[PDB]
């Protein structure tokens, strides 16, 4: 919904146009994470609602792969200090799998975004620059140098930070002979700039080539001008008083005679109980649709803390419930959230096997993917008639539950069936109650879990047995623990004669 708002605020603020332009951008200096993805998603959701009003939109995702190589992350060979100063799109790939350093991190992210079904126009600074797509706007930068410096000192002073150095140029240079950054020394009134290469050297370079890059403060608003960016969310750090945005909101005006696009602050994203987290990490246990929904369910300035542990079970339940309400297959605002989280138009409900139950079924080794699917059918969680998408969705989720149990689930919920019963105190009352449950199971090949579960309380009530004594005993005889999986659906999933013989304390 907050995306529809900002949509109204965009049709209002900006004039009513034919096609709008939304933008997101990242520097591939390392692994683009779950926090960076929030920016692209925010641009996509607003762009999505914009189409929901009949307008047309272009979502530009800009890769600042032309930024210099400042620092060497962890896991990246230390022997790569030699490439600092070079643009990332020309720095080698530490692992060899790709052409550049920037490519390794860009490919991973673009692939992670596809599985989410989110479409965008990927642009590369390195290509736009080289092609001279920025020749003109770059010259203006030099033509309005004093103006730019004026603006940056205007804000630097509010924060009592010292003014820009006297011989400051709004752009840098990449030495053609060594490709490392270099301070610009001189300029004309058109093209050509002189630079003083680090160490010992001098030289001239033509702006019309691609070795004259606009420093970020100018480089951003120029970009908003070149393309017609109408909306572009950004990190808190760029929206702080005299930061990127405020300083660009002026440069684009006083230099490119344009109004800056509207913006929005998106907050932090992480996992509970907690070293970078990528979309790949969430994929190990979260369906792509779930990921999308999680980002559409929060307000931009409320941080997202995903519980990949025990709280993942209620996550799926709430998600499933909303999907059911959306298709009316179950008894208002969440409704539009479901639409906005989906890149494509909602087709129909797809078989939903309760995550918490797969976590249980997946811990019974004598069960194949087929067996699991069949259990789900008998206990009626998924229709008997499964489409292609349905079996495709249930199989993936089964794998997601198997992954969650191995790596994210707390130790408490792990269990294993005891092939033989343990020696445990069992009162005459419980004994007779288990005998009644076994008889009911022996005379009822078929039944619904819901009723089986009612029968389990009935027998306990008739004999006068508390919950802790009743359930902790059944859990102990079956899995050797005091607590365990929801009882009714658990027992129904096991070999029937195994449950009967165990209840009868004879096997
Ligand atoms: Zn690579
Ligand atoms: Zn040089």
UniProtKB/Swiss-Prot annotation:
Protein name from the UniProt record: Lysine--tRNA ligase
Cofactor note: Binds 2 Zn(2+) ions per subunit.
Record-linked HAMAP family: Lys_tRNA_synth_class1 (MF_00177)
Cofactor: Zn(2+)
Protein source organism: Pyrococcus horikoshii (strain ATCC 700860 / DSM 12428 / JCM 9974 / NBRC 100139 / OT-3)
Gene: lysS
GO biological process: lysyl-tRNA aminoacylation
Residues at which Zn(2+) 2 binds: 175, 178, 197, 201
Motif ('HIGH' region): 28-36
């Amino acid at each position: 919904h907050w995306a529809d708002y900002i949509a109204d605020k965009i049709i209002r603020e900006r004039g009513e146009k034919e096609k709008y332009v939304v933008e997101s951008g990242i520097t591939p200096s390392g692994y683009v994470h779950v926090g960076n993805f929030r920016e692209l998603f925010t641009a996509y959701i607003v762009g999505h609602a914009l189409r929901d009003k009949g307008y047309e939109v272009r979502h530009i995702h800009m890769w600042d792969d032309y930024d210099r190589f400042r620092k060497v992350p962890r896991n990246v060979p230390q022997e790569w200090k030699d490439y600092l100063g070079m643009p990332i799109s020309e720095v080698p790939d530490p692992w060899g799998c790709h052409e550049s350093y920037a490519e390794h991190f860009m490919r991973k992210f673009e692939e992670e975004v596809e599985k989410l079904g989110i479409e965008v126009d990927l642009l590369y600074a390195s290509e736009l620059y080289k092609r001279g797509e920025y020749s003109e706007e770059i010259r203006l930068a030099f033509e309005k140098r004093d103006k730019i410096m004026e603006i940056l000192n205007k804000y630097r002073e509010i924060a009592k930070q010292p003014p820009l150095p006297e011989n400051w140029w709004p752009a840098m240079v990449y030495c053609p002979e060594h490709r490392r950054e270099a301070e610009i020394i001189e300029w004309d009134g058109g093209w050509k700039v002189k630079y003083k290469c680090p160490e010992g050297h001098e030289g001239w370079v033509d702006i019309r080539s691609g070795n004259v890059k606009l420093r970020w403060r100018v480089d951003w608003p120029m970009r908003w001008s070149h393309f017609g960016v109408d909306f572009e969310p950004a990190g808190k750090d760029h929206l702080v008083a005299g930061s990127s945005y405020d300083t660009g909101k002026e440069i684009i005006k006083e230099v490119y005679g344009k109004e800056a696009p509207l913006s929005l602050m998106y907050e932090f994203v992480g996992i509970k109980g907690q070293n970078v987290i990528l979309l790949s990490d969430l994929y190990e246990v979260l369906e792509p649709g779930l990921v999308r929904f999680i980002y559409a369910r929060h307000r931009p300035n409320k941080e997202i803390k995903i519980d990949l542990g025990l709280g993942i079970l209620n996550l799926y339940d709430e998600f499933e419930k909303v999907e059911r309400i959306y298709f009316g297959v179950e008894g208002e605002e969440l409704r539009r959230t479901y639409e906005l989280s989906m890149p494509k138009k909602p087709e129909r409900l797809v078989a939903q096997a309760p995550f918490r139950f797969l976590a249980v079924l997946v811990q019974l080794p004598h069960l194949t993917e087929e067996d699991i699917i069949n259990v789900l059918i008998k206990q009626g969680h998924i229709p008997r008639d499964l489409s292609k998408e349905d079996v495709e969705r249930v199989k993936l989720r089964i794998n997601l539950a198997r992954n969650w149990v191995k790596k994210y689930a707390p130790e408490d919920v792990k269990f294993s069936i005891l092939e033989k019963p343990p020696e445990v105190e069992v009162s005459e009352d419980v004994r007779e109650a288990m005998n009644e449950v076994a008889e009911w199971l022996e005379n009822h090949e078929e039944f619904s879990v819901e009723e089986f579960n009612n029968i389990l309380f009935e027998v306990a009530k008739r004999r006068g047995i508390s919950s802790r004594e009743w359930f902790s005993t059944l859990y102990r005889l079956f899995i050797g623990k005091e607590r365990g999986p929801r009882l009714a659906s658990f027992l129904a999933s096991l070999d029937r004669s195994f449950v009967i013989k165990r209840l009868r304390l004879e096997g």
